[PDB]
């Protein structure tokens, strides 16, 4: 069932994730603080968190078997397009359905609809994002499946601007097979029912969220006063 190589891929992705995701959120204290009374009083803090998250996503992606072996240009495009999606995925670990919020260890760092509203966004985006998280949490994925889904998301050959798609596809196919085989031999019924199919449908939902966020990011960042509240890395990665 699970070949050595596939076990090796999982071993590497789990190590990578462990090294890029602190489930105590200790570093949150170094962000500009959250204000939950400009109207966007949660923008500074949430931009900082996003920025931070982008750095961790980059660290995770560098450990994806083969990813470092792509050209820089393809590494850059893949990361630019996926960053928001991987941050959304990786956020499922703090998300809680108790009260539909992202619970990052304390009340100060517990984010709900109103916080995200205080970051400049609307309910037309915020609602599908909570719906996304609910559906994804309902999957109750194993950590091995979760890290696999993040990597499969990063190594997508249809991202606009990808130069060597045959090589990106090669990587993702390996991750995909490993994921499919993992579920077959590790994920026991009845949680494994059409599990791959639901996980890949989450990748589709993420593209849709990506598209719409890009639109709102475009209207937010268009105002220089709001752009001023973002980070240099965020400006680079999402654009100006």
């Amino acid at each position: 069932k699970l070949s050595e190589e596939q076990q090796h891929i999982i071993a590497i992705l789990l190590d990578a994730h462990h090294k890029t995701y602190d489930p105590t959120y200790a570093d949150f204290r170094d962000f500009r603080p959250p204000v939950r009374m400009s109207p966007l009083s949660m923008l500074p803090h949430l931009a900082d968190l996003v920025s931070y998250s982008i750095q961790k996503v980059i660290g995770f992606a560098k450990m994806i078997p083969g990813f470092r072996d792509l050209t820089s240009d393809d590494q850059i495009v893949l990361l630019k397009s996926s960053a928001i999606e991987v941050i959304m995925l990786r956020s499922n670990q703090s998300f809680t359905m108790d009260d539909m919020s992202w619970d990052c260890g304390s009340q100060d760092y517990k984010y709900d609809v109103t916080d995200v509203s205080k970051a400049g966004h609307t309910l037309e985006l915020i609602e599908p994002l909570i719906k996304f998280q609910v559906g994804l949490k309902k999957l109750n994925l194993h950590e091995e499946e979760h890290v696999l889904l993040m990597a499969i998301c990063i190594v997508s050959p249809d991202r606009p601007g990808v130069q060597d798609a045959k090589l990106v596809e090669a990587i993702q196919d390996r991750l995909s097979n490993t994921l499919q085989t993992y579920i077959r031999c590790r994920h026991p019924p009845p949680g494994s029912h059409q599990l791959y199919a639901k996980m890949i449908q989450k990748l589709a939902d993420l593209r849709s969220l990506n598209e719409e966020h890009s639109k709102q990011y475009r209207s937010l960042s268009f105002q220089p006063e709001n752009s001023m509240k973002l980070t240099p890395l965020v400006l680079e990665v999402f654009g100006n």
Binding site: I58, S72, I76, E236
Partner: peptide
């Protein structure tokens, strides 16, 4: 393309 901060965190 260019992306000095992104590129630098990758190397």
């Amino acid at each position: 393309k260019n992306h000095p901060m992104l590129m630098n965190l990758l190397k």
